Every structure is written in structure tokens, then in C-alpha cells.
Amino acid sequence: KVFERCELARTLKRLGMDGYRGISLANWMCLAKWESGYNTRATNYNDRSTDYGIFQINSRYWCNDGKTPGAVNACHLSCSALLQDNIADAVACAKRVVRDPQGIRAWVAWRNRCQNRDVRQYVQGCGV
Numbered sequence: 001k002v003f004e005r006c007e008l009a010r011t012l013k014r015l016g017m018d019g020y021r022g023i024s025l026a027n028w029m030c031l032a033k034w035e036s037g038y039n040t041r042a043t044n045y046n047d048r049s050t051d052y053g054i055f056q057i058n059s060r061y062w063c064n065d066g067k068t069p070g071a072v073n074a075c076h077l078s079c080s081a082l083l084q085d086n087i088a089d090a091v092a093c094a095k096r097v098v099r100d101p102q103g104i105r106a107w108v109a110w111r112n113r114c115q116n117r118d119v120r121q122y123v124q125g126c127g128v
């Protein structure tokens with residue numbers, strides 16, 4: 001599913017993402033745009049791991065895709081649950097990811113496209 005901007009924004013607010021571990025909704029939104037373009041089916045293949053879904057969660061430490069060497073499955077979820085039109089499991093696993101010391105900097109794209117920039121644009125006009 002390819003979410004529209006405010007639609008995705010309303011779902012994340014409802015799922016408790018706003019201000020979670022100090023990460024504003026606008027930042028979660030900025031991360032999702034750059035990582036997947038709001039598409040839940042987004043998949044990126046690297047040599048030894050695959051990134052899944054809307055937040056591009058990695059198969060090495062987070063989900064089990066049954067084909068990754070050294071998999072820890074910290075989210076205790078199959079990676080296929082991160083390619084669902086329903087994003088409740090992805091939000092839940094993304095919350096776990098930022099509980100780690102790196103926080104949202106775990107994603108290089110956030111650092112390069114969102115960090116220290118005006119991200120108000122992602123939620124303006126959404127009533128969120």
C-alpha cells in the first residue's frame with residue numbers, strides 16, 4: 001500500500017508514534033518518505049541482509065526472514081509482517097529499533113535528509 005501523506009500521519013499519531021522516545025511525528029514521517037516513499041511493500045536487497053517495508057527495517061537484527069546469516073530477531077516477527085498493508089507490526093518493530101542507543105540515527109537516511117532541517121512540512125495541514 002502507498003499511503004498518502006496525511007493519511008499515514010493520522011495512523012502514526014493513533015499508533016502512539018508522536019514524541020515516542022522523543023521522536024516527533026514530523027521526523028517519523030520524514031524517515032518514512034526518504035526510506036520508502038510511504039510504500040509498505042518497499043524492499044531493498046543488500047549482500048547479506050534485506051530492508052523491509054515503510055521504515056525499512058533490516059533483517060539482520062530486527063525481523064526474521066529466514067534467509068539472513070546471523071539473524072537475531074529482536075522484534076520477534078517474520079519480515080513478511082512488515083510488508084502488510086496494515087502497519088501496526090512495523091510501527092511496533094520501529095519502536096523497538098529506536099529503544100536502542102542509536103535512536104532514529106540508526107537510519108542513515110534520517111541523518112542526511114531530516115536531521116537539523118525544517119520537517120514541519122510532513123504534517124502541515126493534517127490536523128495531527
Ligand code: NA
Pocket residue numbers: 058059060061062063064065071072073074
Ligand atoms: Na533478524
